[PDB]
């Protein structure tokens, strides 16, 4: 029973908490108070072995404080995350790397890209952009809804076998 | 960040049952943290109660656990203790607290309440 | 209380001063030590996590160690906003349960 710790990052908006709530508690919630951050703890069998998730929704102000920057750094995994129908928060995703690659100090931290929101009528991000930047990442990329579900547990499950390949 | 707020009667005749509240507001109390309560008779020093977890599962100072039950309402995001047969030996401030992190240990006391004083007397 | 804890300590404007913190082996013997600052009419605040850590906001004057079935908090450079209680407190696995020091009046004299 091995614990993993993921954090999930991303710009405001983007569905930080729908994406972990849907994880935990298998519901969509359209409207979560965006201060609160908090970890959340789930037990899942991924390819036959018992997981410990600890995932931190972030969502407090994007400051860089040294307690802020050792909380982020017990994250062994970080699901980036934007939002297909804003670019401001693709655009973010670069700098988000940016600071995970300093307080981990390293350029192969385990990360997943994720673009939520997918089960939009429209979208200002295309698949082969966000595609392009996860390979010239090294990282795989999720395209997620959690309005549907639809790859949520694809996502997250991604992050810890990115983990796993890091040892 | 997550803020805690007891709420009881500030009289208790012993023989009876005291009865607190902690309203949390800023943070799921499905979160992984364990919920405490702990006292301070006035003028005197810190004694822990007890502490829940979101599923369910308690630990109660040993001293207090014949008299102690601390629950959970998810549904309001409380937790609530329960202390029967009290007598002045209960008589302090009462607080509510979450700590004791799965992500990051901070200790079993990373946030209190304001604390709220209950006095047991005939 | 379960750990013995000084009942108050002293010092002047800019000394050193220590609390001291005793358990057993079943407590600060075997659990990490944390420090709560009170002040008047206020809840505890943590000042020193897993005996030697400093959370945000704690300045460097204060400092924290662990010896054996010992715990102390040191203060350097005492300031008149200092005088607080002091609280230790660590996990008990005799009696499954947190356990505290009776707490440390602090006074700056002079």
């Known amino acids: 029973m091995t614990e993993y710790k993921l954090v999930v990052v991303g710009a405001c908006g983007v569905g930080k908490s729908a994406l972990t709530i849907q994880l935990i508690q298998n519901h969509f919630v359209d409207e979560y108070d965006p201060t609160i951050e908090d970890s959340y703890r789930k037990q899942v069998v991924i390819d036959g072995e018992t997981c410990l998730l600890d995932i931190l929704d972030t969502a407090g102000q994007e400051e860089y404080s040294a307690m802020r920057d050792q909380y982020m750094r017990t994250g062994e995994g970080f699901l980036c995350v934007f939002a297909i129908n804003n670019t401001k928060s693709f655009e973010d995703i670069h700098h988000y790397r940016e600071q995970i690659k300093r307080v981990k100090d390293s350029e192969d931290v385990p990360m997943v890209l994720v673009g939520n929101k997918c089960d939009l009528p429209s979208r200002t991000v295309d698949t082969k952009q966000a595609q392009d930047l996860a390979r010239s990442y090294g990282i795989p990329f999720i395209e997620t809804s959690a309005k549907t579900r639809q790859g949520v547990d694809d996502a997250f499950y991604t992050l810890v076998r990115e983990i796993r390949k890091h040892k | 960040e997550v803020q805690l707020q007891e709420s009881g009667p500030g009289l208790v005749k012993p023989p009876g049952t005291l009865s607190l509240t902690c309203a949390v507001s800023?943070?799921?109390?499905?979160?992984?943290?364990?919920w405490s309560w702990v006292r301070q008779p006035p003028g005197k020093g810190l004694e822990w109660i007890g502490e829940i977890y979101h599923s369910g599962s308690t630990n109660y100072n040993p001293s207090l656990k014949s008299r102690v039950t601390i629950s959970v309402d998810k549904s309001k995001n409380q937790f609530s203790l329960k202390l029967s047969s009290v007598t002045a030996a209960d008589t302090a401030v009462y607080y509510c607290?979450?700590?004791?992190?799965?992500?990051?240990?901070?200790?079993?006391?990373?946030?209190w309440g304001q604390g709220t004083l209950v006095t047991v007397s005939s | 209380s379960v750990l013995t804890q000084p009942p108050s300590a002293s010092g002047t404007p800019g000394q050193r001063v220590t609390i001291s913190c005793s358990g057993s082996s079943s407590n600060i013997g075997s659990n990490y030590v944390y420090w709560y600052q009170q002040l008047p009419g206020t809840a505890p605040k943590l000042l020193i996590y897993?005996?030697?850590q400093r959370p945000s906001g704690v300045p460097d004057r204060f400092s924290g160690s662990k010896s054996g079935t010992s715990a102390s908090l040191a203060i350097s450079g005492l300031r008149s906003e200092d005088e607080a209680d002091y609280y230790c407190a660590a996990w008990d696995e005799r009696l499954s349960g947190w356990v505290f020091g009776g707490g440390t009046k602090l006074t700056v004299l002079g």
């Open positions: 800023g943070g799921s109390i499905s979160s992984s943290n364990w």
């Open positions: 897993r005996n030697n």
């Open positions: 607290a979450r700590g004791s992190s799965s992500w990051y240990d901070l200790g079993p006391f990373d946030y």
